Curated annotation (Swiss-Prot):
Residue span, Peptidase A1 domain: 17-328
Keywords: Aspartyl protease, Disulfide bond, Hydrolase, Protease, Signal, Zymogen
Source organism phylogeny: Eukaryota, Fungi, Dikarya, Ascomycota, Pezizomycotina
Family designation: Belongs to the peptidase A1 family.
Highest taxon above the source species: Eukaryota
Name this protein carries in UniProt: Endothiapepsin
Positions annotated as active site in the UniProt record: D35, S199
Originating species: Cryphonectria parasitica
GO biological process, one term: proteolysis
Entry's EC annotation: 3.4.23.22
Disulfide pattern: C255-C290
Keyword Signal: yes
Length: 330
């Protein structure tokens, strides 16, 4: 089997992308944030504290003939940005772009933090990291991909995120029309539960590529590109007027600047992020100061190849027995 679904930016900055997901019988369609940096599929629901729901579409398990309560099970997750959610657990039929998994754990939120409430466009998350990170207790549950894997024509999914435009998540096949040139594959470590890999270096604008190992994670659920302070400083030093602002929380630059591209290495191959992808717009409405899309990972504890990087590539998440990542230009 295969599936193919369009993913759409939630706003004009590509802060996140939402993909429609059918849950239950008859289907209830919710727009979920596909997150290769976590491993829980959780949704706003009829059980979510009413005051914490503001515009989201909710899952109502009592209206699904296929919903089953997982007795006594709970879940609770905290993300890197300090947001969180928790609740109880159902299994139900979940379909993505025509691909159906029966008995998928659907984690129903009883509580969500303010960041989730305040974002009316995101009805929940669909985790695509390794199932070892799943937070269900007492027994951990499998991700949608892990459950679908054996049925897929090939044990893969691909992310093809758009710049200020829709893109595609495919399951079970590689669309050879969706990229230019060849896909370069690189090793993955699952030791921390992530799609963790080692980039071979970077270049700033037209500068010569610097060969250096950069360990990090391919994370569709993180907006920006977070890299070591040395790398990030080298980038912003090429932008007139750019500076790190402790009050704003990162590198800012004059909105009138023309940003250089940023290149990262995948083996002997190279992915070029255009300068425009690195512009995240005015720091506040009407400001002439803009927020940068490449920021330091110091204090996160891990480097993160988030949407700014991933949207410059066609990315293969190969879930074979020995997982790998593939990157192609597009």
């Amino acid at each position: 089997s295969t599936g193919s679904a369009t993913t759409t930016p939630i706003d004009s900055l590509d802060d996140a992308y939402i993909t429609p997901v059918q849950i239950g019988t008859p289907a209830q369609t919710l727009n979920l944030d596909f997150d290769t940096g976590s491993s829980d599929l959780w949704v706003f629901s009829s059980e979510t504290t009413a005051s914490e729901v503001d515009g989201q579409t909710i899952y109502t398990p009592s209206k699904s003939t296929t919903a089953k309560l997982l007795s006594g099970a709970t879940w609770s997750i905290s993300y890197g940005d300090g947001s969180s959610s928790s609740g109880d657990v159902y299994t139900d039929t979940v379909s993505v772009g025509g691909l159906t998994v029966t008995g998928q754990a659907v984690e129903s939120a009883k509580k969500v933090s303010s960041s989730f409430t305040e974002d009316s466009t995101i009805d929940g998350l669909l985790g695509l990291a390794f199932s070892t990170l799943n937070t269900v207790s007492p027994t951990q549950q499998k991700t949608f991909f892990d459950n679908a894997k054996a049925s897929l024509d090939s044990p893969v999914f691909t992310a093809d995120l758009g710049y200020h435009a829709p893109g595609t998540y495919n399951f079970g096949f590689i669309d050879t029309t969706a990229y230019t040139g060849s896909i370069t594959y690189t090793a993955v470590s699952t030791k921390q539960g992530f799609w963790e890999w080692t980039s071979t270096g970077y270049a700033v604008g037209s500068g010569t590529f610097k060969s250096t190992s950069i360990d990090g994670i391919a994370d569709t659920g993180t907006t920006l590109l977070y890299l070591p302070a040395t790398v990030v400083s080298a980038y912003w030093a090429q932008v007139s007027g750019a500076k790190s602002s402790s009050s704003v929380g990162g590198y800012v630059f004059p909105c009138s600047a023309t940003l250089p591209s940023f290149t990262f290495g995948v083996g002997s191959a190279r992915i070029v992020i255009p300068g425009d992808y690195i512009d995240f717009g005015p720091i506040s409405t009407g400001s002439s100061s803009c927020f940068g899309g490449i920021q330091s990972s110091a204090g996160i504890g891990i480097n993160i190849f988030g949407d700014v990087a991933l949207k410059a590539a066609f990315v293969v998440f190969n879930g074979a027995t020995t997982p790998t990542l593939g990157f192609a230009s597009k």
